[PDB]
């Protein structure tokens, strides 16, 4: 029965080790992502939560019929 239908204990052992590593990495990544999101939303210095500001290419830099603009 063991030879025909089943494998050794090492296979399940090491598959469990690999699975545990993957899930632990995922958990640490989720916590890190939550912290990064909190910091980016609080500060606004990262690539995220960059709300638009007015384009400075729209400004007209020409004499305006009045020296003081």
């Amino acid at each position: 029965i063991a030879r025909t239908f089943y494998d050794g204990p090492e296979k399940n052992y090491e598959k469990t080790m690999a699975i545990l590593q993957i899930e632990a990495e995922k958990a640490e990544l989720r916590l890190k992502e939550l912290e990064v999101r909190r910091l980016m939303r609080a500060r606004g210095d990262g690539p995220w939560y960059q709300y638009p500001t007015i384009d400075k290419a729209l400004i007209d830099h020409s004499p305006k019929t009045t020296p003081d603009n």
Binding site: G44, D45, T53
Partner: protein, 53 residues
């Protein structure tokens, strides 16, 4: 929500009227043209969150 078709095509459908410092006819300046241009140049490219403070 916002589909920025104008920016994709470079069309300028309504951007000419959005601000006081953008190409008025006969180069007539707004009352607060200098303050507005200073604010826009200061706040350009840093995002609303940073630009508020």
């Amino acid at each position: 929500p916002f589909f920025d078709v104008q920016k994709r095509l470079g069309l300028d459908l309504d951007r000419w009227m959005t601000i006081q410092s953008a190409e008025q006819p006969h180069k007539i300046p707004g009352r607060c043209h200098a303050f507005e241009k200073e604010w826009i140049e200061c706040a350009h490219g840093i995002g609303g969150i940073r630009a508020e403070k």
